[PDB]
């Protein structure tokens with residue numbers, strides 16, 4: 001797996017973000033996570049967390065997995081990094097997201113995020129409190 005460049009177009013919510021990728025605008029859905037929707041509990045906090053993360057990054061990178069790169073709604077499915085730190089993992093670590101939608105062949109970073117979730121549960125963080 002490798003990191004490709006992209007630029008913020010627009011923060012959207014806890015687990016979707018608009019990026020420019022290979023010069024095209026495109027909504028990305030964060031692999032292996034599920035944030036609450038904005039209208040749910042911690043939805044707003046999730047959105048703010050990612051928003052802050054991507055808006056403050058000097059460098060956004062996109063990392064496809066080995067499988068499907070687009071979902072059925074046309075969203076790009078990737079791991080997204082903000083100055084080297086993975087947003088997907090960061091959300092889970094803070095208990096702003098659950099590990100979720102784990103499909104085979106698009107699950108490289110699965111155990112890494114389960115480690116993170118386990119620590120967030122342990123600390124009773126946000127979702128787990």
Ligand SMILES: Cc1cn([C@H]2C[C@H](OP(=O)(O)O)[C@@H](COP(=O)(O)O)O2)c(=O)[nH]c1=O
Nearest residue numbers: 029030031032033034071072077101103106
């Ligand atoms: C995370 C992810 C979601 N999806 C699809 C499955 C879900 O289908 P349904 O809409 O049929 O429930 C939907 C959930 O995304 P959201 O959590 O953004 O709604 O996105 C994938 O197909 N692959 C993925 O990796």
Ligand SMILES: [Ca+2]
Nearest residue numbers: 034035036037
């Ligand atoms: Ca969601």
